[model samples]
Target: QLQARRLDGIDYNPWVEFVKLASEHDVVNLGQGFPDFPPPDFAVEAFQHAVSGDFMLNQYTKTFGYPPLTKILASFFGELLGQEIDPLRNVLVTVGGYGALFTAFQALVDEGDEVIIIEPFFDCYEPMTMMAGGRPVFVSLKPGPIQNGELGSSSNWQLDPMELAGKFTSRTKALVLNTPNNPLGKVFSREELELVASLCQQHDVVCITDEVYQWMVYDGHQHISIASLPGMWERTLTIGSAGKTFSATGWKVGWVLGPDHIMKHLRTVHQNSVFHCPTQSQAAVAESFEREQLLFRQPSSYFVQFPQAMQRCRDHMIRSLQSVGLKPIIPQGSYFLITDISDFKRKMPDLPGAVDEPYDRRFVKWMIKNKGLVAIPVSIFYSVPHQKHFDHYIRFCFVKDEATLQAMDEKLRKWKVEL
Candidate 1:
């Protein structure tokens, strides 16, 4: 039974454990954060063509990337980052965004180093930090009282300047940041990014900028890259995903953009691990990026249309959840929509032996099984010390198709009548 202890924390991600209930019961799943809709036709067509084209594509590609894919990404993000990117030096194509994340941590973080991680994060950061032999220090995006009296916007979740600064110290290694963040979908503004960047400069801390949902911002909310700020380009490793970009989660294509110093370590880790991603997906993504480059900021551009499409689903889901007596915390970006669920506590009284678990956990079980709708408990996004503070919220994925949304709406309506 002897084995490596490094594997312990990252091994058991709870989302997969509870998600099986959604499948067995065949409930309307708004649990996992993937778009149920088909990906862009261009990417699909390109993938099909590659699969049918050169037999060499069926073979392994460059260890860092398949050349074409990394070249296009370097060119693509180079324009976005306002600097020229060396395809081989500035980028490393990994299995996915999560792959890029693990590689960064494994390569950069050392034992006894401190990594400051913001709370309500994409759950993987905690385990990934542990796996990297780093201790995770936490701070929360504290909720502020609203002036409008309407439902709260995820933008209302603010990082307290003093609390954030207090977490930094000499041992600080890197800070993991996600703009257009998942779960809460709180897009950090330019001023916010500057604040964090300044602190990172003060502490000489490196940054892991998770920008997978970069293109999915809503209501004119801009996603400012921490790396793009002055004095930050060298200290930041920016992670991106084609899955989020092109609505193709199955592709598992993603990369990290950084200057040579930070990226060299990531390249070393990538070479040692899952060196090359599958060639067909990379080839397809290359074509997709090439197509996107020509269209750029045009109305028909995939980047332009994707966020607009997501906003509609977001707006519709807000009203739908509201109609069913749930108060939605309006998300500014990302595929998720979280809502306050304290009111439903009475209806979902504790089942036998349920007292040991959080309220939101049992609530999801009851809601999904009896009400035929599934959601993720927001508490899972927090650390053990902070989980109780966030138990009143649950997250729902809004990137579903029309049929899926309608199905959830119908169930909510029926559940409303009974309530």
Candidate 2:
């Protein structure tokens, strides 16, 4: 009764609900997006060093950000995105990428303003816009035919440009772009980003570019920020996270990049919401980025090493999924792979009242309870119009430790016939 009506109808929090169920069943959890393994030792050591050494590291930082951290980030992302990012004007630190996105909506979206959200989004974008009293217009990253005779990659997922452009009307306040997208693991191409940027230009819309998985790309694909495109610097607010970059989701250090005209409002929202982020986490992330600066593109760099490790894990997960007769949409980036679970519908026992729920949800719940594996439903990432089309797929986090993945392989192997 104390809760606001804005959250009405959005009844379930998918990850929280599923994660809890996984614990009850003691399932091999692939539901949460976080890695079961540890973040880099250097990053953890940096935090420990800060805790042990500096008393001020425990204090509140500047409302906008810690000078050392934000300045380094400005320099770091400046090189990455090819923008002359100013620490004071271009950056605003927040709790996480989630916080950065929430700030963007709260600051810019007034009641009745239409915000164009690409469907099968990061789940939060839709509800957050609702909380800010804006209307979320939906477009989808629909799957098209695979090219080059490849066993279906997430790259096959493409946006319908004309459809996307139609969603941008005069009242459109912004377009949310998530490259190396969650659940699907599809990275946006340069050509696609250019098209979206053009529509934003035509509609006078702000571009909220979520590039948290910026360096988590696999194969040969690159992560391109829409902000880097021509004429986007003035209108784009690029959101990034240290958590994603360093495999430290617990740290919650995220930021926004844009011109002062756009970012001033976000600062207002941030100041009113989280006045100051945790200082030590900011400092530790600063140290990590500081080291990464000099080693940006080197073979020995953590940027190279980290994704390499994730790619190995991804490959093992793909092979494991395929062995069980599940078709995985090979991720081009991020730590996730969405697999088609429709074939196993006949295998798992269909319980009472489960048919009323979405297909992906029913499968994942059944898998957790019976097969001892937990995963996320792809339908949860979609808007209402796109939900039905995505019900057959489930998202898995492949960033788990070697032992856990091997255990999954053994379980799938033993249960291969039933699967």
Candidate 3:
């Protein structure tokens, strides 16, 4: 065969099919995780300035990161962690947070080594581990008690301490932690973070944390970085996204931070593959970081204001879903809100792929075609074996403008009246 063995079972992505389906239907798309609005003036202006001013901004810079960008990143996060960070040695800027994750798996994982992941996770974690010849071990955050007729918080989703401990073993090479986790938006509490940190220390496992949604915490929920825990800094590689931070996903700039000893391997992987990130974007992100650092904790700052606005958006969608008899699990952080779709399933006619597909997937497809509205299925976040257990829910993005969300609201209300 001409193709490599690693590509055998890793060719498909749920987003590809779902996006295509939504595109074909001409629906109000709330399926994907991206802002429908433009970025802040400070961020946009910085990019505009970068593109016009410097000739070198168009060329390649350092493989690890653009100098000023790395230094500002180091200064900001270093103060937060209470550890002095080395800009060049500790950070490696990549194509995106997606790129940072890929590099981490390739650089650290070995054949037959295990990468422990929590389900329902960001979908890429599974395939990335597999592509690097690492076996993925699964542990799930189970739902706790929630009273009927009451909208529960994402915090109700908890990891069983005993079940989690049982998953770690001698071959465990790493544990991937996504605070303000995707799909569920469950921000792990300090106690929960400490528990995972302790297990990683005991197992001598690397902690690859995806903290891209670090600034999106709401309702006084603190976004605690696992790397900030004692004994975790040395073992942890924290990943962050400029896209998520600045609301500029198209820029596709992200970075990873850790001790130099562990980061050297990531540099090797970066050098061999994507040698450098875009010079102008990194330069622009640097300016944005500097402005944010100056306005740290101030109400005017985008870091403070974006979450406040998104919280309002989340509340609006919650009300909209509740009005239609759908129970939405309130997100503590991030752009997603998951709703229980079990009550509404009876209203739809079974389609061609009903037998072969998960109910949520079929429901979304039907909703797109019939209702002219789109949402992502929650089942896709889980592994194949576990998908069936959580297939009764769907996720919607709450980061859209008032007009688009109002349109979605109107569509859903009409559908509800029809039901």
Candidate 4:
């Protein structure tokens, strides 16, 4: 009986709501996956430099993308993708990576079209596909324990190739790919990427590759682009985020790159929704890309350095969670780390019962109120029916300063005694 047309039941975002409550209560935030630190000094300085220059700091650029920015992106990504990319035709800069996703869905999916999404995903992929009149089909990453005393890592999550192959059908329009995937931070290996690529080629489905965390892999794991596979460049839209890449989430610059056939439709959505991104930000990113071009050739690069520092931060947080009796799942990539919260049932007396509330949601709220720590309930990333089955986990963002990590460690160490 709802009249809002497919979006009525989709407005509830528990993550944002929880974050707001945590902030209101002045809790320490490890909930959202945004860096609590500033972006690289060079990138920030480039933006400030652009603002001071006389190149129409407030005016709009091309509808499809910013000229200089797109050109630079084409060159930079062309090197990584290892293919020649046309700046005008291949790249479409958008308001953010979220916008790029929306554009791709709107452009490619028609009524009754089906899209494949990996489970414990970014949470936006489901609603975005629904809004675009596509049905979302999910495949979960099966969990396992780490080898030896190596700690629980994102490498523990693996896709069942047979299960994934079963999801591809004639009606399928596209498959969402997030390497160095969010929530769990499992970087799909080359073998896994090949399995997906094979399915896409066989089923003739588009691959929307979200490589926003391409530079954030850990422990020497390589982030592979599905587009780099044979027969995939024409069928894959590789999405990248400057905010995630440069640690400047507020700037909100993102781009989509693919062959002209698929990218042409994305251009329509880009023109209709967000014609162009901010002018100064685009100009500044162009400058940053020029530097990245040079820095990438060197052995020790910021793109390389950031992930190394983040890996140390990730390990520190993993140890901190373990010390407090929470079994943390260390991620191989991305900024997130998920932990099992079942041990809390033995600790907190006020924890929820099955008849009253789900444990993960209740535990998250209780932790925010009592422990002054904020983390996201994993159930929010799953579909309604799947929520209860996966509600035993909570995710934390480790993209913080060393001091913040130390503070969290201290707080957890003290709280362990109270439990």
Candidate 5:
């Protein structure tokens, strides 16, 4: 094989596989983490304005980031982190949050360095660490009991402090943290973050915090950036997505914020890899952020209204799933929720040659083919050894429009009639 050794075991991506499955079956796709609806009006308008305004917007901007975007980002995030930040020195814009993560891993991780990652993470974290030649150490958030006779909240999923502390050793060079996490949508509490912060400080670990869903929380679960903690400023690289923030994942705009020392290396990776991102999107994203900054805490802010819309969608999906006897782990943040499908085994038998696959994987394939519904299997987010423990769960993106969600609801109802 002419392939490099770095890609030996990293070939498979669930999104690629599931996306194909959805397309082949012509299913209504709620599997991917994108919204089927349009982004905010102002965000879209800004992009349109940029594209039609200055022809210079089409040219290459700074390698790190466009001037206005980086400047506003530093100020926006500085206010959030309660610290003055240097825009030129501290901010580096990448293609998306995905690129930010890649740049971070490449710049920070060396061969044989240990990187601690929480389980049910965004799938890229594992492969990116491996691609960087770092060894990944895993810790899982185990589900706890139902509360007040209601289905378990994402809050019920907790990381064991002692178990987490044990994973950090002398070889541990970094800890990748995602608050308002993917797949499970579990927002780490302040106390939980403090514990992790203390361990990072104790073990001298660099923190790569993904706050992509920072604005998507519900039920008053505040998103706390770990970098805001005492003594954490210097060693933390905070990653955020304008796509996620503005409901415009297609824009592919994301940025990383850190102190100059840490950012310099990320810049090295950025320059070597993606020298310049598109200028028009950066300018538009800057304009959007500027609008949000003006309406900061007002009810008119997209940051305030977007989550309220998503929480309604979340509640709607929760009820719809519950009606069909599926137990959903109610998410407090993010646009996703994972449901237990162990009970659905009776309804969905394995397709031919699917006996060896994880139950959730086979089930989702069947749902797409027969029920015309698409969702991602939860086990895909875990390491191989941990997959079996979570094989009965599937993740759904609840960020779709009302009509789209209603279509899914009717589909589920029709399926229940068949059952």
Candidate 6:
């Protein structure tokens, strides 16, 4: 029999349980990170066009990536990164950014190598490194106070440069850098990127930069790539997701771009595991890029418009959470926002024997069970040692439609009376 520890930490995905329970209990699902909206019409049309086109739909293309798709991705991202990218050697289209991350870890991280991760991060980074026989080192993004003594938002989650530098040792092999990062939606500024870049250069460490939410910034903040920094391109494996970019999470298409030397090993891993990504979806992404490029300067483009709409949704959710006394940290990028739930104990009656459950987890469960509102507990994103220290926060995705946001608002308003 497979023992309980055989699965070890694999069975602890909080989203899996929360999503399942949300669906089973008919709760409003704000737990999962996927967008509820359909993909752009242009991208959909591109897919349909590819399905009817002459390309081999049933057969696999090149092991690393489809030729046309890789070329387009390289060209498009080259323009964005302002660096020349070779489609044949510099790009590898994978099933998703998640797959790219796995391939990177498998290819580069050997046994006893140390991988530095910033918390609260995407929860998969820890497990992916563990599965690849790498030691995962975590550094928490310290919460800073606001300038005017006002309550802090997600922007307050700043890295301690000295502390981060201290985490790197001779055993450190790589660092996973996610700007406009998940859960907290904190975008690392250029100066911060420089700090990390200097450290990586000093330590001769490789960087796996996740820029999936690159375009989703607000309030004049820019998403800078660590790969763009001096001496970084050759040592950086940059990953991006078309699903997050185009609101088509189900498509499961993503790509990695970097120097040929490092990317060659990742290509081997990609071929060994999932040899070729869905060809039609890749073609569809290429076609979408063709049109998106034309509409790039236009204000009506979904790529340009989606973030604008999301900013408003984020503000609305912030208001809703604030109404209930949960001080939400306003995110500058991505669809997610984290809120401090520490004040909940002052607002809600304590359970007789449930004092140990963190305020974030307790509030999320209470909101879901009583108000049909669903959110992810942020504790899951931290390392075991740091989880409880940062468990007073929960994350909510603001990618829902206006009607859905209204429903959430109404529920919270009603729950306020009961509280």
Q: Which candidate comes out best when scored by TM-score?
A: 3
Off by over 4 Å in 1: 346-353
RMSD of each: 1.4, 1.8, 1.1, 1.9, 1.4, 2.1
Give candidate 4 misplaced runs (Cα > 4 Å): 1-4, 145-150, 297-300, 345-350, 353-357
What does the lDDT come to for candidate 5?
A: 0.90
* Segments of candidate 3 deviating more than 4 angstroms: 346-351
Give candidate 2's whole-model lDDT.
0.86
Q: lDDT tens string, model 1, 231-303?
A: 9998999999999899999889889999998888888898888767899999998999999999999999989
Candidate 2 per-residue lDDT over residues 166-283, each given as its tens digit: 7878899988888889878998898898899888888789999999999999998998888888999999999989999889999999999999999999998987887989888888
> For each candidate, what is the lDDT?
0.88, 0.86, 0.91, 0.86, 0.90, 0.84
Model 3 C-alpha lDDT per residue in residues 1-419, reported as the tens digit of each score: 99988876789887888988888986888887899999999999999999998897888888789999999999999998888899988988988899999999999998899999999899999999999999999999987677976887899898899999999999999999998999899999999999999999999999999999999999999999988999999999999999999999999999999999899999999999978788999999999999999999999999999999999999999998787777899999998999988777655546546565888998888889988889999998898888877878999999999998999988888888887
A best-first ranking of the candidates according to their lDDT comes to 3, 5, 1, 2, 4, 6
lDDT of 5 at 126: 95
Best by lDDT: 3
Q: Estimate the TM-score of every prediction.
A: 0.97, 0.96, 0.98, 0.95, 0.97, 0.95
Worst 10 residues of 3 by lDDT: 346-355
Question: What clash pairs does model 4 have?
Answer: none
Tens-digit lDDT track of model 5 for 28-127: 7889788988998999999999999999888999888999999999999899999898999999999899999999999999999999999988999999
For residues 17-123, what per-residue lDDT tens digits would candidate 4 score against the true structure? 77678878756689967888889889999999999997677787778776889889989889998989999999999877888898899999887999999988888
Off by over 4 Å in 2: 1-5, 146-150, 346-351
Q: Candidate 3 — which pairs collide? A: none
